[PDB]
Amino acid sequence: NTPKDQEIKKLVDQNFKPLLEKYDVPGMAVGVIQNNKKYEMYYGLQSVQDKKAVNSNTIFELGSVSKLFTATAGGYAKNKGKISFDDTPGKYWKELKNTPIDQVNLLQLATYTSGNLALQFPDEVQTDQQVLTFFKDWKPKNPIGEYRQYSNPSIGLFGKVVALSMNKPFDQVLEKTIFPALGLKHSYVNVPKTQMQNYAFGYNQENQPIRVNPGPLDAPAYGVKSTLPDMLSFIHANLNPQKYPTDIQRAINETHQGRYQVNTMYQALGWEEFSYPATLQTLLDSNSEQIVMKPNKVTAISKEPSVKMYHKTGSTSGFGTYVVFIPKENIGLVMLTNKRIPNEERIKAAYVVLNAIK
Numbered sequence: 001n002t003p004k005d006q007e008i009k010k011l012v013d014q015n016f017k018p019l020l021e022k023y024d025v026p027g028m029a030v031g032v033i034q035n036n037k038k039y040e041m042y043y044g045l046q047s048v049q050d051k052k053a054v055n056s057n058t059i060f061e062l063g064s065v066s067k068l069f070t071a072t073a074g075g076y077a078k079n080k081g082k083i084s085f086d087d088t089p090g091k092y093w094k095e096l097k098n099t100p101i102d103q104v105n106l107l108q109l110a111t112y113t114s115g116n117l118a119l120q121f122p123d124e125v126q127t128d129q130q131v132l133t134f135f136k137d138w139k140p141k142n143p144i145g146e147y148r149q150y151s152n153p154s155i156g157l158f159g160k161v162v163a164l165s166m167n168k169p170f171d172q173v174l175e176k177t178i179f180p181a182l183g184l185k186h187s188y189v190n191v192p193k194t195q196m197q198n199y200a201f202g203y204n205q206e207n208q209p210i211r212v213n214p215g216p217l218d219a220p221a222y223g224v225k226s227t228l229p230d231m232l233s234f235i236h237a238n239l240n241p242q243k244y245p246t247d248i249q250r251a252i253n254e255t256h257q258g259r260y261q262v263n264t265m266y267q268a269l270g271w272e273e274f275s276y277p278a279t280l281q282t283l284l285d286s287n288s289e290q291i292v293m294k295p296n297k298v299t300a301i302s303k304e305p306s307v308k309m310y311h312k313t314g315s316t317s318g319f320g321t322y323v324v325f326i327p328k329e330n331i332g333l334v335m336l337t338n339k340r341i342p343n344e345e346r347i348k349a350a351y352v353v354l355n356a357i358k
């Protein structure tokens with residue numbers, strides 16, 4: 001009676017479109033993939049001052065969704081035998097050998113359980129020497145492996161170690177190896193001069209234009225930029241790993257493996273994992289201030305569900321991201337905004353749309 005493309009458009013209009021007015025968001029891209037059919041919805045402006053409309057070429061900052069590519073790079077290196085998750089960083093970054101940080105394994109760095117790493121490096125840490133000094137001077141606090149504290153330095157160090165293991169800088173690992181293996185054409189650590197015209201401005205809480213600041217180990221933690229079509233291709237790879245070459249197939253499957261529990265949230269590699277079907281409140285609880293900002297004692301997985309779903313939020317000063325996929329239903333959703341909106345609104349909108357689709 002109404003074509004599938006129009007039904008998805010109507011659901012996204014009902015649930016995502018009102019957030020633009022509510023939070024004064026200049027631009028938004030919402031993608032759905034179902035049964036290998038991609039649906040792209042674009043709203044508003046990539047640049048207010050240049051009057052440039054959001055389109056399929058628009059490049060957004062992914063923020064912490066960048067961690068999913070770092071995790072994928074880690075999975076790739078492990079399954080090629082370049083690293084083991086039981087290894088310590090000193091094995092690859094020789095200047096960390098026999099330092100206290102060398103008592104933390106790569107899996108613990110990737111999944112934020114060092115027991116003494118905060119969300120950000122200190123502001124003063126900028127250069128490679130300052131990053132090295134920081135990790136050399138690092139001392140434990142909580143028992144290693146027992147406490148989850150969401151941390152850019154933690155997965156940043158994991159990223160740097162993965163890069164050393166593949167004998168390339170981290171930016172080249174993604175741009176030359178991982179992005180091409182996933183078939184991504186417009187995904188960047190460094191947006192080249194020829195694509196700056198497609199790079200959206202972010203907008204802060206006063207709707208002033210801004211972009212991400214350079215930082216220590218930024219690329220592996222929050223430094224990736226992508227388009228809606230690329231992020232839908234990335235969700236396709238996660239929904240259909242069997243259709244990709246062996247190396248990247250095993251990489252993707254590695255990122256789906258739950259490592260521990262924090263109540264109903266299973267920490268996989270980058271991805272957060274949930275028993276499917278999941279309640280809205282289970283997905284909302286995953287990004288509570290308690291889980292995101294504070295240390296939490298982890299428990300061993302005591303119930304492994306047969307059927308799972310996965311999501312990840314991402315924010316920079318000027319951009320919001322949300323990606324979610326459900327293997328059982330062969331469906332996923334990407335939301336990109338050039339203004340931060342509350343995580344709860346991203347998760348709720350996606351939940352209603354993915355549960356409403358026939």
Ligand SMILES: *[B@]([O])([C]N1[C]=C(C2=[C]C(C([N])=O)=[C][C]=[C]2)N=N1)OP([O])([O])=O
Nearest residue numbers: 063064212213222292313314315316317
């Ligand atoms: B990640 O996005 C955690 N997160 C937020 C940021 C960040 C970085 C900047 C910047 N200009 O460097 C500004 C604001 C925020 N880095 N890492 O995960 P979630 O939990 O979705 O915030």
